[PDB]
Amino acid sequence: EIENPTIAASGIVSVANTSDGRIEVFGVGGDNAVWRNGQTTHTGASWTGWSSLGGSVTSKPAAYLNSDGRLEVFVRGSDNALWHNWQTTPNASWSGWQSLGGALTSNPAVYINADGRLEVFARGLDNTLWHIWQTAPHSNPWSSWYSLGHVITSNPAVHINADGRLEVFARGADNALWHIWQTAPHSGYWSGWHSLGGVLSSDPVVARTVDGRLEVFVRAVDNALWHIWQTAPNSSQWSNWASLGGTITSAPAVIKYFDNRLVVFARAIDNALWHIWQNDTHSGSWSNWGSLGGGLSSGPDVVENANGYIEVFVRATDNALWNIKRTSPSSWSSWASLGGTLIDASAI
Amino acid sequence: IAASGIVSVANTSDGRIEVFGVGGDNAVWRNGQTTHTGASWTGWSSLGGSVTSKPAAYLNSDGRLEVFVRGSDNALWHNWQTTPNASWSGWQSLGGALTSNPAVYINADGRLEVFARGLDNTLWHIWQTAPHSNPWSSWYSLGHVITSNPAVHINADGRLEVFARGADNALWHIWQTAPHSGYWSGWHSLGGVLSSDPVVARTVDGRLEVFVRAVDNALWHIWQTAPNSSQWSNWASLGGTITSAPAVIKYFDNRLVVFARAIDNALWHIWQNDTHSGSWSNWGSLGGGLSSGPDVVENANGYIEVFVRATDNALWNIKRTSPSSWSSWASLGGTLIDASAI
Ligand SMILES: CO[C@@H]1O[C@@H](C)[C@@H](O)[C@@H](O)[C@@H]1O
Ligand SMILES: CO[C@@H]1O[C@@H](C)[C@@H](O)[C@@H](O)[C@@H]1O
Ligand SMILES: CO[C@@H]1O[C@@H](C)[C@@H](O)[C@@H](O)[C@@H]1O
Ligand SMILES: CO[C@@H]1O[C@@H](C)[C@@H](O)[C@@H](O)[C@@H]1O
Ligand SMILES: CO[C@@H]1O[C@@H](C)[C@@H](O)[C@@H](O)[C@@H]1O
Ligand SMILES: CO[C@@H]1O[C@@H](C)[C@@H](O)[C@@H](O)[C@@H]1O
Ligand SMILES: CO[C@@H]1O[C@@H](C)[C@@H](O)[C@@H](O)[C@@H]1O
Ligand SMILES: CO[C@@H]1O[C@@H](C)[C@@H](O)[C@@H](O)[C@@H]1O
């Protein structure tokens, strides 16, 4: 069996914007339960503190905002089935845990189709890519499970093309970046598999540029941040792999700045939070790596807050969730503890 | 009503502004940024047709632009990209008998839905039967009597909500009972005395806010007190003496910015100082000589772009170029007419 390098450490929480402009974070507690924390209001003046959604889980959770404004959380259960939990009205009471069945061997990843139906992707018992979907927009019930085939050796990553076609990425048995896409938006058909090559030592992490090009970030076997991109929207042509250097020890976290420039965050060999950023959205010019310090026991996860500024979440050495955020166009916040005790329940 | 904007302004799925106006021949003409940097424009191309309303462009969730306009026969007509950012379909009739500009929004299920005043002066609507696809429903009346072009937005919970001035010149609104539920609410009055179309934004914290010119020619606004709120604020005056429909857009930090032509026919703007206190700036001039209201969009650099017709009847452009700077006033040329149906 081709040997697959250990994937870079995952982030500690699923970070989601609510329909009322607040950050909500979902992590796994010492009791194996999903625990939640969120801003009291969109100004982010304070947080609610940790409350338990309960359950007993065996993956990193994945939260997603339905097109009717209700958050929904996906996780692999004690039984290796997919379980989910939804707000019953926006930013209100939670449903409790419902089984969607299956036999999963990775974290679940979620995206929304061009018709408002959520669709979840996970490695199945046979190590092929599996998927499942809402049968109606922002609503139960769900399909049964289907295999898209292949052999994958990482958690899958999912995004949507400029033309509304979902596209999923994973490391293959050969360590290359593999991907597959809907033939047209929720057409009922997928394209078959394409290798982008490379030798990955992390999950793929996918953004769409403001001009509509998918761009994928990975740690490679040299422990550098590498990336690769569509040459145009929906393009039949990808770039060559290009190194951004560094010695990173986490999955990269990617977000567009308020001016749409890509910014990548990762833990480095010194256990600090580091970041590197586009100088512009076309020429392909990137900055040098800048440290933001801290002592990280996980990868970062990132969201844009209601002030239009980047917020970053990590687990610290005290196993609490820590937060650092932009406070203006020209300044970072102080490191602050949001407390809690979080375990890394990442499935791979 | 207060003078309308001259163009429908829409972002493409490949991060370029496209503008759609009516030429002196009554055809729909379009102009686009050559790339997402917005450094240059293609120049004007004709989509043809003979039109009797302002066009309304909208991006389908499959990334294809689509333009809606009232035809010579007062029916709704539409023209769509057959693939994203490529060739146009030409003009197809969706029938009906319309007495206003069409306004368009996308449902939580990816179906476009078009609102216009009908032959009996009630609110009419029509929708795609499947997401981002033909064919369309037949026409249905949601009733009432309206005296302005309708405006449409979506609540934080995915319910479409439509705004129109009534025969009392008050702001009226009606909403889906739930996202694309098949049912709508009763008509409700938010009062006031409007002298323009309503223009609607949704705040970053998920509250609908409506801007109007009032009978005193001042900018006024009213807002939901909370997302999906069963309670709105009182009307509040932002003052000024404006001679166009206002145009509203969130800044990169989500502060609302409102643009309007003033009595001096210059482009003026006023903005929130923050998104939690109801505190607004003073009016600031950006100058120009305007023969229309402004239309606004956020470009692929994440900055506000503004489009107005000038005294020469050309389309002019001013935009933010950074966190700290405006662009030059640039002429995109052409000759545009105001084909607004009301
Ligand atoms: C705030 O509560 C603390 O953090 C949670 C995430 C859980 O690990 C819990 O057992 C612990 O007591
Ligand atoms: C509430 O149910 C508990 O949590 C779920 C997420 C599943 O792991 C299930 O097996 C377990 O009993
Ligand atoms: C109904 O869901 C649609 O059809 C299924 C058969 C799958 O192809 C899925 O990716 C797609 O969104
Ligand atoms: C149709 O799908 C498009 O072309 C394919 C050949 C791939 O390059 C894919 O990334 C892209 O989305
Ligand atoms: C560029 O062409 C000019 O502007 C167009 C919008 C039309 O009004 C046309 O008749 C005129 O010649
Ligand atoms: C292309 O067809 C022309 O333009 C349409 C928008 C309609 O006004 C129609 O009656 C006219 O003949
Ligand atoms: C299918 O379309 C849905 O049902 C129709 C009967 C209308 O109520 C419409 O607003 C809604 O989007
Ligand atoms: C259910 O609809 C909500 O409550 C209504 C009574 C109105 O305030 C409306 O703006 C809002 O969307």
Residue numbers in the entry:
A (entry chain A): 23 to 370
B (entry chain D): 29 to 370
Task: Provide the authors' original text about this structure.
In this article, we studied five members of the PLL lectin family from P. laumondii subsp. laumondii TT01 (PLL, PLL2, PLL3, PLL4, PLL5, collectively referred to as PLLs). All studied lectins belong to the seven-bladed β-propeller structural family. Each blade makes a W-motif composed of four antiparallel beta-strands (β1-β4) connected by β-turns and loops. The saccharide binding sites are located between the adjacent blades and are uniquely organized in two separate circles around the monomer.
The newly characterized lectins PLL, PLL4, and PLL5 were produced recombinantly in Escherichia coli and were purified by affinity chromatography. The PLL chain A blade W1 interacts with chain B blade W3, whereas in the case of PLL2, PLL4 and PLL5, chain A blade W1 interacts with chain B blade W5. The PLL is a tetramer in solution (sedimentation coefficient 7.6 S); PLL4 and PLL5 form dimers in solution (sedimentation coefficients: PLL4 = 4.9 S and PLL5 = 4.7 S). PLL preferred branched fucosylated saccharides (BLeY and ALeY); PLL4 and PLL5 preferred MGMR. The PLL5 gene exhibited negligible expression under the conditions tested, raising questions about its inducibility. Among the PLL family, PLL5 had the most pronounced effect on basal PO activity (one-way ANOVA, P-value <0.001), elevating it to levels comparable to those seen with full activation of the PO system. Nonetheless, the extent of PLL5-induced melanisation under natural infection is uncertain due to low pll5 gene expression in early bacterial growth stages. Interestingly, PLL5 was observed to reduce ROS production in PMA-induced response, although a significant variability was noted among blood samples, likely reflecting inter-individual differences among blood donors. The mechanism by which PLL5 inhibits PMA-induced ROS production remains unknown, but it highlights PLL5’s unique activity among other PLLs.
